From a paper:
Dedicated assembly factors orchestrate the stepwise production of many molecular machines, including the 28-subunit proteasome core particle (CP) that mediates protein degradation.
Structure 5 shows the assembly factors within a completed β-ring just before half-CP fusion. Broader regions of the β5 propeptide are newly visible in structure 5 compared to structure 4, suggesting that its folding is coordinated with the progressive addition of β subunits. After emerging from mature β5, the β5 propeptide winds back and forth between the β-ring and α-ring to secure β6, β7 and β1 and then crosses [name] before terminating with the interactions already observed in structure 4. The β5 propeptide’s interactions at β6’s interface with the α subunits clarify observations that the β5 propeptide is essential for the incorporation of β6, while β5 does not require its own propeptide for incorporation. Meanwhile, newly visible N-terminal regions of [name] in structure 5 support the β6–β5 and β1–β2 pairs of subunits (right). A portion of the β1 propeptide (residues 16–34), visualized in structure 5, resembles a staple extending from β1 to β7. However, in the half-CP (structure 5), these elements are exposed, and either the majority are not visible and presumably dynamic (β2, β3, β5 and β1) or the β-hairpin is splayed outward or inward relative to the subunit center (β4 and β7). Structure 2, when compared to structures 1 and 3, shows progressive steps by which individual subunits are added. Comparing the half-CP in structure 5 and the preholo, premature and mature 20S CP structures reveals conformational changes accompanying half-CP fusion and eventual loss of propeptides, [name] and [name]/PAC2 during 20S proteasome maturation.
Numbering used by the authors:
A (entry chain F): 4 to 245
B (entry chain P): 48 to 226, 230 to 248
C (entry chain A): 3 to 234
D (entry chain H): 1 to 6, 12 to 19, 29 to 141
E (entry chain K): 112 to 166
F (entry chain O): 30 to 180, 193 to 238
G (entry chain N): 1 to 43, 52 to 76, 91 to 223, 233 to 247
H (entry chain Q): 16 to 53, 60 to 201, 204 to 225
The structure:
Amino acid sequence: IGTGYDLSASTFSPDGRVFQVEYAMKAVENSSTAIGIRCKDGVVFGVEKLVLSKLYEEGSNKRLFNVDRHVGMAVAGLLADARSLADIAREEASNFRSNFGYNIPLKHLADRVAMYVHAYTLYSAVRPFGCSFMLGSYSVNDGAQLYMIDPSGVSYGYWGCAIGKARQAAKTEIEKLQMKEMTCRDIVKEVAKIIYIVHDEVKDKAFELELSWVGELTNGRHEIVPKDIREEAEKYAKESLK
Amino acid sequence: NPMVTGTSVLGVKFEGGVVIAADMLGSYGSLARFRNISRIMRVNNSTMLGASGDYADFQYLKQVLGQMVIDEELLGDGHSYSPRAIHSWLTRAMYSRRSKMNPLWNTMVIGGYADGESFLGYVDMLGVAYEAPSLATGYGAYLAQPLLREVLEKQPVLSQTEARDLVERCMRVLYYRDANRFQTATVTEKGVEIEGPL
Amino acid sequence: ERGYSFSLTTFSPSGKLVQIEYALAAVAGGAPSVGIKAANGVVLATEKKQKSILYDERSVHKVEPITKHIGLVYSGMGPDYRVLVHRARKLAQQYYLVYQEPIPTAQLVQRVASVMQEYTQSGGVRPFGVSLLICGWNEGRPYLFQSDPSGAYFAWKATAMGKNYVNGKTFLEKRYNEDLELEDAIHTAILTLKESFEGQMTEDNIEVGICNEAGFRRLTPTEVKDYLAAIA
Amino acid sequence: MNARGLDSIPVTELDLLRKGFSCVKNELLPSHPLELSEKNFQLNQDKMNFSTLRNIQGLFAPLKLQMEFKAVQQVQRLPFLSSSNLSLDVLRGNDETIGFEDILNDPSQSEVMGEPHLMVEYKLGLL
Amino acid sequence: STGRLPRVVTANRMLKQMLFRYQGYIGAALVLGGVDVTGPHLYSIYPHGSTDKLP
Amino acid sequence: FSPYVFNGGTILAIAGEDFAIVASDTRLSEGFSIHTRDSPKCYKLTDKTVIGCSGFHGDCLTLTKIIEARLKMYKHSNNKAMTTGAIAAMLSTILYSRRFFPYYVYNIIGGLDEEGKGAVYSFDPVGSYQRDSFKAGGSASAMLQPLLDNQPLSLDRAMRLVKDVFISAAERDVYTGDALRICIVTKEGIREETVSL
Amino acid sequence: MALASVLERPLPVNQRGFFGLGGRADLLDLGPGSLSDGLSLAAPGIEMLHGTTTLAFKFRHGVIVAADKKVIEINPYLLGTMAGGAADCSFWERLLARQCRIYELRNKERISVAAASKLLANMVYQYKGMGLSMGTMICGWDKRGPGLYYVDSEGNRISGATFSVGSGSVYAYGVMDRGYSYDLEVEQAYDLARRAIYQATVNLYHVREDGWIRVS
Amino acid sequence: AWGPEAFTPDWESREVSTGTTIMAVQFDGGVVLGADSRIANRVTDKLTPIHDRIFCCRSGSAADTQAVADAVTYQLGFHSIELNEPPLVHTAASLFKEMCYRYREDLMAGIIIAGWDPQEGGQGYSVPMGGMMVRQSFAIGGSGSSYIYGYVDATYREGMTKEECLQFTANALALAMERDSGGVIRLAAIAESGVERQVLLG
Amino acid sequence: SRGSSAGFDRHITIFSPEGRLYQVEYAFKAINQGGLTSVAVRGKDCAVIVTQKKVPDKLLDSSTVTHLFKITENIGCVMTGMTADSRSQVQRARYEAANWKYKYGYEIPVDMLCKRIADISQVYTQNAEMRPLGCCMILIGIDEEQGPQVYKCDPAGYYCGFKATAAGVKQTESTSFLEKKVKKKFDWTFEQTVETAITCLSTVLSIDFKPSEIEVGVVTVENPKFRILTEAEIDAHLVALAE
Amino acid sequence: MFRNQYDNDVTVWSPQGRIHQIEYAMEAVKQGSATVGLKSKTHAVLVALKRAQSELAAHQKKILHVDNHIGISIAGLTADARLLCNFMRQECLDSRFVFDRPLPVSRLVSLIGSKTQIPTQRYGRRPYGVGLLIAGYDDMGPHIFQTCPSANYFDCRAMSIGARSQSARTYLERHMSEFMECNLNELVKHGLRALRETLPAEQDLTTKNVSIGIVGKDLEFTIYDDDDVSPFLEGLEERP
Amino acid sequence: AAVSVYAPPVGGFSFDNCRRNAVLEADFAKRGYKLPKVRKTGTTIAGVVYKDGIV
């Protein structure tokens, strides 16, 4: 109960809480589920993308962006805020490369974007962001890395993450994987299977699977999964459902 | 305040693309000790750039142009900069900098091969731009332009080997004028290939 | 009515400002402090909030010097006290640079009060919740001033402020003399501080500073202990 | 390095008693090499700090600093009176240093001052 | 503010930055010397803002 | 550092009862060296007006681009294409906008008017303009104007005159090109052809 | 980009493409603009009227101005003359005509000669020493009778019954000084103006109650 | 004219130079930075430490170079604390180049940077007047840059021992200094184990 | 700004009838939201910081979860409260230290850094646009003439120097335990300081600790650079304490 | 009942994590009239339905002109439409001036979304209450884009917005498989038949209440009004 | 109140008499007059660092 102290981002509840940030975090659970799994030699993403109508193209309103040559990104929540944060991340990476002449480390980029997100929960002239996102990268001298940022502005490193409406079941399914000793080719199928298991068809008419990895196979580049591998993963997931 | 000339840059057009040769020498003034530096840039798969003049401005423009190319290829919507777009952007940048009496001391040559047609442009620090079958800027600008012009006038259509031989002999004549190393770049359907130093 | 108790820039129908009264109430709820002007010096005494063994004696002090001949003590909030101390030091240095002579006490009090007045007339801020006592010595004549959160200053001969200050004021009225000396003034200050004290006073829970023709000096704990043992 | 800093002749197609004794030719160029440098010292210092902070840490730091400056510089006196600039000096870091702007030509004792309403209107942007 | 005696390097830095700010139009060549916790020090400042440490 | 460079050129314009002719050479040079032998100096603005400019090349390019942008702006705002007189007035204002740092360009505008007759306007690097019947500009204007003055006509005789004037002027000038371009503005549109020199 | 919009002061640091002390910031805005009007700051052949002679005097029935075009028709009721830089004269007198039309529309009454001359002098005085060169005589008729003023680029503004500027100024001025008379008929005034301009070495205007006319 | 021939401002000859001579030579394990002495002085240190393993030498105006060095030390320390790692020589060279290029019309500054990092070993960069940034095996600047360039170029060989590199640098600096002066030559060898400074006199 | 809420409780620039600000007290209450506790002890020639380390998930990366930061090469830190606010204040402190070093030519002292942070934090209490940060900062370091130093600042803008302080949920019990220990005796070596710092937390939380459940940072006179101890050394200290 | 406190500004989150003012602004699109936009392998077509205040007033225009290869259609407020049109025109003009190339539609719509997102986060502003349909042509062929007051844009193959556009959307979905082979004729006819489903069953389409905009491979953006629409209306059927 | 003041004034150095003095000095030198000069100090100074202090 925080009635009366929840109309601005610069007001403290009598027990020391800010409720606008809590409402913003609650707003993320209104969208579909996106997961990301870090493995021995790469990072692979997967998004359950709902279909609104058949009048839209194949690549409309995607949820997987290319922040840089070596960094991927997956979002959840309000889409416009996701586009704005993607633009911010691109600008930060470009500025670092221009200043210092080499690719920006993932931890530094995560810190920059997390601080930019946190700056919005301090003043009464703006409102907190309403989206979470994950970042993934790979390099020969550092290895795979994965991070999450939430509307409050807190970032952490993960071995496997899940954001959206059904993060609990997705986390339960992920916690049964030995991702430390497998390979991206063996993780794409698991990601597809988890996405298919989590999806609920009663309240959601249809969906399209979206996948992309980064790692040693792509030579340190973030790319979309080829169509044949997507088809094979979908077929395996459908067979495993039975 | 004192002024000195710049290194020589050559360029010709042949059937499949363009050939550009540049000098490896640092500068003709007191900076002669900075030898063995490259002046040829690869912009994208169908554009290459050669420079003659100040080196710091060349590096600055290299940074800006590379960042722009990376930014456009990140989106992946299927659109890329043509050689003419780079030519126009360079001309506008030079003119805008000149109008403020803080010019960029350079003289660029742009070559490319898009849509089956070759390109060859010229931009200087004052904003003067045009296109010609052959170009030559630098120390021997007036001793090499008429030669290439008449050679191309005799034969409007030239092959790759003939153009390369003509460039080599022009560079040899220029060195014989005053007494070492250079490099050559080519743009064709395959892409931008740089060979050097020689 | 509570309709005029929230905003700083609103006059009550009776012609009163309420937030300034509340700031004064905040001042009147801090630790006690006493100032007495003797015939050849001024003494300032106060309590300290630490009262513990984990505190480091060299860290933070309540009696602070502005110039060679000016010092002050406060009662109220501490964070609001630090900024005012810094501004006072800067103003004194500016005056010395311009006029090549140390600043008189009255001018410093006037300028500090002028700074404090600005925060009681604009919407979007709050008044300072602190009150100040300034002592000095100019032309062979001691001075003692007090500055309110409103920006109004008075010249005093003996005053008390903080917790239980009405009883301190009447105690001082009963036992003040115009022909005192520095030692008698110090004894009276210690006694009137002990009047409102609750625990056992030692040399580790009070601060004393004096100002005579030599300059402004803060007494060491050994001297405070010696003075305390004198009166038992 | 903080002191080193790095076609506006409109024609009315978008009172002469108020403004006078000024020509474009004289104000085309400065009278001394140190004039513009001294007039714009604080702006140049703020720009340098913002540049280095943005290059090292990110966008959030200069934005937060500018937001704090704007918020704290809105509770001042009206322009025809002199303010103290306490919290702005604290935030900016100039609360323990004295420069040549403080001991020379005290702004609190200026020899000229205009009408109140005129200054308040000019600050608001109406005039 | 700091509660302890200052250092020579602080005065040297302040003087150097001032003289460099005013572009050498303020003609003042100085010889600065003192002793602090680190030890004795001696400097040499010039009107254009260039210092130099010598014995 | 001189921000001005002179480049050769020569332009001409003849106004008729129902036609207008604009012609120019096609050489770019810097006094001694020859940049290109193919660079026309006549630009088509609308279906009924043509502009020809010579002088410093960068200023010419910037002026043409600004003129085209302003034409597009006017078409969007007023829902119609702007006429020759409006173009002349706008160009005069644009030129005078830089009185204290002028464009080093000489312009000549030719086209049809509202009533359907030829119109020719001549400018100066500051912006003064007036309507004429025939005008010659460029480097060789001084040695070409008396010939035209001592020598309205029909289209064919005017073309014959233009050809002989340029063939006589090219042999005596060091900036004339190796080709001549003529643009004809009539009621059915605009057509142009190149004559070797 | 909502936090940066609140700060109503766009700095180059807040924009895109910023690195180092500068960056790709001065090379971003290269458009042709939207709408404005303003002369450029200070850093070829400029047409100037050299061999021109003008003449103007006022009498009972109006003002007669003659010259050897070289006379600007500002309004149906106002007349002007150029001397020096043609472009400057044309531009500033166009501005004066626009100002007069604005005044008439606002106040529903025609402007006077004195006000127009003062406006022109005020406009041309701001750029003293920049390089402008112009000399103008302004003719008209208002509620106070005929008027005649002389305005130049040096700030001079004088009123008189007889003026002359040009190469043959001395001879023509002497002739029309010898032959001047306030109570003069229109025909004799025409003859005097023609004789003066002839001896100076032909246009001729005449301002009346209801606008100027052309004689020859 | 100036258009097709691409004339250059020629920064290095704006004013005549009669300063000291500075040199940096790369050997196998690191880099050796040295400077000579050639009025008053003779007890002055000409080597300015930027970090624990990064040094620099200055040429041109004293005040401008000192201000640039102070600002660069600021920025490098802040960046190293932020990234939580020892700095790279390339970063320091870029930081110098930015201000040396933006203020080319106001300051007369020429910087040479030498140092060691665990990623690429001993490196030496040259940032002369104008803003150029080039890495070189051996870098020469100052007054003898024209007098000793041929000898240094002819004699220099590939990576040698630290002692041999020190001897070669000392010989080159002595030949540069005795052009026709002073007697004090300062050297510094930078390696992984740490800097090792020494002074040669007499 | 969208106005100020009405009430003696709902804004930062409104005094209560009894003369007290309540938003500052609520910011103080916001420190206990994390659920962790920190203890700092000063020795004869050393200073030690001890804090908890809770890793609830199993998919988390334990290497990226920490609360000990580093301001300069010779100043440590530890934060309690909201994570994002703690990180933002750490960044501000780093910037202030760098600026002081550039402006004055030598390293900033611990008390000067704490005073600067407190002075900045006081401004948020006197303006209607900004709000206090819900965290507290503890710094350790070594002075030249004086030995070790321990300092603490709070959201209200008040700072002080201590001999042994604590912060978090169990602040009162930790303070009582440290008071008893200090009153008993204060002459401690390097080994004794770490032992008593660990013992205080152990006996207050009633938990037998494990090497992966705490993190320790020390500063000593011999090596004045901030150093974070490893799991092996923490386990060695725990074994010595148990024996 | 409990919503009265959290639906007065765009800077306030509801206890369910919803911004009610954005949802309120999204309802202004349904206050206009129906618009239909479709595309084929070569051409892109916009069809709009015009309303009039009375019999003595001209019908309000809905289809505007942005560049030689881009055109837009409006449904919602009017001031916001004018402001957005000005922004579009300025961006296209600047791109053409600088690069001597047409501005890609994808980049243009991304700029629109980036500009529109801002007033939904800061105080003292309101969201744009207008929805647009964009038809263009570039190196990738024809394009149809849709814009929303919530700063969201989609890449469509056939879309309808306005009042009572559900029938048009249903018709387009049913007849989606034949659009990519039709030439300009029968494509304008499919668009007109789709637009005719938004009307009552008694009345039909005349020449004074329809506007057509076409852009193609070698045909610039053109608008057909009044008597220019008769050739397209000749072949329609009797509303089956 | 003055009718020609729009913004509050500031402090620091003043450059009002720059051009006036610039032409006045040239005129006075041309006609051969004298103007007040600036006092200067040129006496020798020195310093040294001994064992535990500065002289």
